[PDB]
Each structure stands twice: as structure tokens, then as C-alpha cells.
Design an enzyme around this catalytic site. Structure first.
Site, PDB file in Angstrom:
ATOM      1  N   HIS A 117     -20.542   3.626  -7.446  1.00 56.59           N
ATOM      2  CA  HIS A 117     -20.296   5.283  -7.794  1.00 56.59           C
ATOM      3  C   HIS A 117     -21.519   5.906  -7.285  1.00 56.59           C
ATOM      4  CE1 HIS A 117     -22.497   6.286 -11.388  1.00 56.59           C
ATOM      5  NE2 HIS A 117     -22.362   5.039 -11.574  1.00 56.59           N
ATOM      6  N   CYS A 118     -21.564   7.047  -7.163  1.00 60.40           N
ATOM      7  CA  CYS A 118     -22.743   7.971  -7.002  1.00 60.40           C
ATOM      8  C   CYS A 118     -22.240   9.413  -7.998  1.00 60.40           C
ATOM      9  CB  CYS A 118     -22.924   8.293  -5.486  1.00 60.40           C
ATOM     10  SG  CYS A 118     -21.621   8.868  -4.547  1.00 60.40           S
ATOM     11  N   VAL A 119     -22.418  10.460  -7.320  1.00 58.19           N
ATOM     12  CA  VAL A 119     -22.066  11.649  -8.282  1.00 58.19           C
ATOM     13  C   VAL A 119     -20.843  12.095  -7.769  1.00 58.19           C
ATOM     14  CG1 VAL A 119     -22.749  13.994  -8.462  1.00 58.19           C
ATOM     15  CG2 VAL A 119     -24.714  12.285  -8.572  1.00 58.19           C
TER      16      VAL A 119
END
Lengths: 170, 170
Positions: free
Chosen positions: A108-110
Site C-alpha cells: 500500500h501507499c497513500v
């Protein structure tokens, strides 16, 4: 079918794409590898998926304080130009091991679109050796984007993927 | 360069296309084959190109009354769904002969985008045997569209091209 596949990919590639829509829910990419945004990461301990790992690509180290999850932190700057290519082989080797051990991992990231999407795209490209790289890139890209709503929208990230995984026969 | 070519084609195929712009001037496609709109056809006798043929794909038979040009009429209905596939082999064989004899020919319809564009796309696909059909389709399509501003925008025509020229290896 080859005819249906080629129609789909080439119409998507010559003008028929949807507007970008921000993904909100987690996507299962392979047997053990999942793709999500920051909320999905916060929700990972509560997921019915028994995640062993979360790959956090945001700039910020966080903890999941009531969770046995191993959070691996590879900070990628929030920029349309981030050098993700330096991390491709390290990330895909890690994801490949998670699939080999049946150890579920959330990447995941943002927003779950660009940094995490690009690492998922790299992983899928690295797992492919049957289909031609160009064809497979177009297939993964458009089918993942249709599923998620937005997927590796940043042109620099697509360029880095293309330069790594599509230039050579495979 | 392969790297520059793949970057160009795949960025064009994953979201980076220009808005469609109506072409106004004639385009030289090969040594002898040209692509244009209806005004270009009206201007053909006055062109410095010594056209031997004009391929008129509009519904209307016209004459060029002060011209030695041989106007070949293959009426294609003005519809987004026209069965152009019935005419592919006849048209490409004709265009191939014009190139073999150095007999310049203008292919045109009304707007010079869809009916005439599709027959030009078919001709170029038929002349190719070196590059993979998928790659060549994406190259011709995007480079012709960038040059002309609009090129085979009708999805049915692209589909008919794909089904004819891209499904088989070549």
C-alpha cells in the site's frame, strides 16, 4: 479468446479508457499479494485475511499496535517522478516469497494508485514468462485499472515499468 | 530506438492521447498512396501530385470534369457501423498496385478520418510482415493519428481492422 482479448486491449489502447476513479477497497492481486490505500493498511489487522506482512511505501513509519503484522517500510517520496526502478527487484523478490510461503501481504501507499500500483505491476510483470511483455503489460494495466478505477496513472512510473519489463523479449 | 518506440506506443496506449482534431490537408502515406478529406479530393486535379486515381469512398458519385484522373467509386455508407471488412482485400490490392506502378492515388471520404482512414490503416497493415501485428497496429494508429489529428476514431472500424489484421501472427 484471442479475438476478444485483442479487441479489449487494443480498443482500450486507442481511445476507450474510463475516467480515473480513486480506489477505496482492497484488491486481491494474487494468491497472497494484495493492493490497497492507506485506510486499507489501517484496516489490515481487522481483515479476515491473516496478513503476515504489510509493505508500507509511504514516507511515514507507522505501527499497528495491536497486531502481529510485520510492517516492512520502504519509503517512496510522494512525487510524480520517484525513482521506483531502484526498488523493483527487491520488492518483487519479497512479494514472490510471500506467494511461495502463503504469507499474505498487503502492498500500500497513500491513495493505492501509483507507488503501490507500480510495485504490483512490476510484480505481475516479473511473474510472467508465457505472454509477450508488451501484450502482458497492456493486459495487466488495463484490467487492473478497470478493476481498481485508477492504477499507475503517473507517466514516470509507467515509463520506468516499460523500461524495466517491456523492452526485452520474455 | 526500441526503448523510445515502446515508451511512445505504450504511453499513448495507457492514457496519453490528444483530443481529436479534424484533418484539413492531404497526407502522403506511402510513395504513391495519399489520404484526404472531400476538399482534398476536389483539389486533387490542381495538386502538384500527378494523381492517376482517386478512390472515392463517399456515397456520392462525382466527376472531376477537367481532369484525366480515374475516379474509382466504392460507396461506403456514412455510419459508425459500416461493414468495411468486405472491401479490405479489394482496396489493399488496388493500393498495392498503385504503389507498384508509381501511379499516385488519393484515398478519401468526407472528413478523411474513418472510412478513408480505415482503408489506409488496412493497407499499411497488409504491407507489413516484419513487425508483430499488435505492435505495428499500435505504431501506425498512434503515429497516423498524431500526424492527421484524427484517424479511425470509429470503434467499429478499429474492431474490424483488429479482427482482420491483428489476430494472426505475421
Amino acid at each position: 479468446d484471442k479475438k476478444s482479448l485483442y479487441k479489449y486491449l487494443l480498443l482500450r489502447s486507442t481511445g476507450d479508457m474510463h475516467r480515473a476513479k480513486s480506489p477505496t477497497i482492497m484488491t486481491r492481486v494474487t494468491n497472497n499479494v494484495y493492493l490497497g490505500n492507506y485506510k486499507n493498511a489501517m484496516d489490515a489487522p481487522s481483515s479476515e485475511v491473516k496478513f503476515k506482512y504489510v509493505l508500507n511505501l509511504t514516507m511515514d513509519k507507522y505501527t499497528l499496535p495491536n497486531s502481529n503484522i510485520n510492517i516492512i517500510h520502504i519509503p517512496l517520496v510522494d512525487d510524480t517522478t520517484t525513482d521506483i526502478s531502484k526498488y523493483f527487484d527487491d520488492v518483487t523478490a519479497f512479494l514472490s516469497k510471500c506467494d511461495q510461503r502463503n504469507e499474505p501481504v498487503l502492498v500500500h501507499c497513500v491513495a493505492g494508485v501509483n507507488r503501490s500500483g507500480a510495485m504490483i505491476l512490476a510484480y505481475l510483470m516479473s511473474k510472467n514468462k508465457e505472454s509477450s511483455p508488451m501484450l502482458y503489460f497492456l493486459y495487466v494495466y488495463h484490467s487492473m485499472r478497470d478493476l481498481r478505477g485508477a492504477f499507475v496513472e503517473n507517466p514516470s512510473f509507467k515509463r520506468q515499468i516499460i523500461e524495466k519489463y517491456v523492452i526485452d523479449k520474455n
